[PDB]
């Protein structure tokens, strides 16, 4: 309700005047640190190729993951990507398929 010591607690944003704290709307937005933000951050909506590992709260932003078989990375945040089923000729499985990489063959 009060901004404690000039900040608003996690899961809240601060008003313009800075006299009152306001809670984020569970499921639509969130904030994680004590803050003086004019308004809360929008929750990340999982893609169709992704699963929701953890749902969005006020205090936390949803965590999404690539569905079994796929992975992602910095340059491919749009659509998760199929792992390769195996290696080429004269190369072997070293690293597995994860939600964050391809298999690695050497």
């Amino acid at each position, epitope marked *: 309700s009060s901004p404690s010591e000039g*900040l608003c607690p996690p899961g809240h944003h601060i008003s313009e005047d800075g006299r009152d704290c306001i809670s984020c709307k569970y499921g639509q937005d969130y904030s994680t640190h004590w803050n*003086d933000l*004019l308004f809360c*951050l*929008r929750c990340t909506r999982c893609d169709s190729g992704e699963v929701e590992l953890s749902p969005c709260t006020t205090t936390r932003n949803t965590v999404c993951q690539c569905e079994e078989g796929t992975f992602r990375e910095e340059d491919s945040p749009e659509m998760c990507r199929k792992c390769r089923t195996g290696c080429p000729r004269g190369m072997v499985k070293v690293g597995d398929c994860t939600p964050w990489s391809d298999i690695e063959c050497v």
Partner: antibody
Amino acid sequence: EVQLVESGGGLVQPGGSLRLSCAASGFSIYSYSIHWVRQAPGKGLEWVASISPYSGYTSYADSVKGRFTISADTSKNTAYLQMNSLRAEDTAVYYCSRYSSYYSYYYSSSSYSYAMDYWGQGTLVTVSS
Amino acid sequence: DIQMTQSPSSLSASVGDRVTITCRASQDVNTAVAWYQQKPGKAPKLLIYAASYLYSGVPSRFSGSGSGTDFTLTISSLQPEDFATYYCQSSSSPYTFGQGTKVEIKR
């Protein structure tokens, strides 16, 4: 007089480190928020990163996440931007900037604008072999 | 993910003309847009903050005047020295600037 002299820009090889340094004088970096924002030659502005020492909070842009790291040393009253695995696309003039929040008010009794209200002169970074 | 869209990308106006640069945010941002004047070589300068507030020391001829999705910087008696690129920026969220609007002085 407030000013934010930055330093550290210059020529880097692709896939290389480059630390920018934003030296704040005339005020206390703590109670404020310091954002870096960059501009590719002849093009518009693009916010890179932010850091608010009063809370501990950092945010970055996605076109820079996991490569760039923002930091700040109240003792030295500077803010940094460590730039790693640089690309040709990162070449720009990087600006640092003071951002008046409200804790700005609670702390020093500033006037806040919830905007970037002082900008450093900017150093150029060019990434090319 | 917000996107600030300015209009126009460029204009020509004569000294003493009234210039009007407008800027439309893709999502609603309350009154949380700022406006910046950037001149060649120099770093951006904040003119209007909050949407309609004149930043300290800026000339009164600059006027910010929006709320919601649509926002309108009005340069009033355009001067020789107002040749500059001008950006509306959603502040509070991600800090998306607009593509910029380019004013040049007709003579």
